[PDB]
Amino acid sequence: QLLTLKIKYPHQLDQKVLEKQLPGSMTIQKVKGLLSRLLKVPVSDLLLSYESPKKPGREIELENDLKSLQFYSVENGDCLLVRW
Q: Exposure check for the chain: N or C terminus, fewer CB within 10 A?
């Protein structure tokens, strides 16, 4: 339920930038909200996707803001890719 996620900004750096613990029922809108305050970039400009160590290099999209992380099968240890 509490997911440890690694954060990456692929247009800035190839390596993981930080780690955050996020509830599995956290909506994408709310994850965007958190990242917005951190990066000082609007929620509406933020584009999110993720990769799982199982399928390296394959980005899965998180388009619908009103759905949750675990709805999208995001798992503990996955990588969240943050673009703007």
A: N
